[PDB]
Amino acid sequence: TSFSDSIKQLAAETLPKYMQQLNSLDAEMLQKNHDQFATGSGPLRGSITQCQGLMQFCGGELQAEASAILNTPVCGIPFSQWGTIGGAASAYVASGVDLTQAANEIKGLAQQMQKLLSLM
């Protein structure tokens, strides 16, 4: 082992699972499982947690891509905030807005995480 590889290695074993999960997402799921999702090892929190690690500890395009992903807004709120409860994301879901586009954009981003796999 290397620290560097351990990080990478663990994102590779965890990101596919979050991705498949997020990829089921819809407006209603979002409204429902947000706390769950933004909690412990839920796909939002887990995946954001995984991208942050690659941001913090790797270099080059893998770092640049983790970054682009975390900073992409999802209806105006950076994806990195979607893994948190009691903030902007929670307020937004707590507004009654249709969450179709929000779920769609998280979907997209989970698909973009494949680039991270691929860079790995």
UniProtKB/Swiss-Prot annotation:
Q: Which terms in the GO cellular component ontology are assigned?
A: cell outer membrane
**Family, as annotated:** Belongs to the YopE family.
Keywords annotated in UniProt: Cell outer membrane, GTPase activation, Membrane, Plasmid, Virulence
Q: Where is the Bacterial Rho-GAP domain?
A: 2-120
Recorded GO MF terms: GTPase activator activity
- Where is the site Arginine finger? R45
The protein in question is named: Outer membrane virulence protein YopE
Single biological process term from Gene Ontology:
symbiont-mediated perturbation of host actin cytoskeleton via filamentous actin depolymerization
Q: Where in the cell is it found?
A: Cell outer membrane
What turns on expression? At 37 degrees Celsius in the absence of calcium.
What is this protein's function?
Answer: Essential virulence determinant; cytotoxic effector, involved in resistance to phagocytosis.
**The organism of origin for this protein:** Yersinia pestis
What is the additional note? N-terminal is important for export, C-terminal is indispensable for virulence.
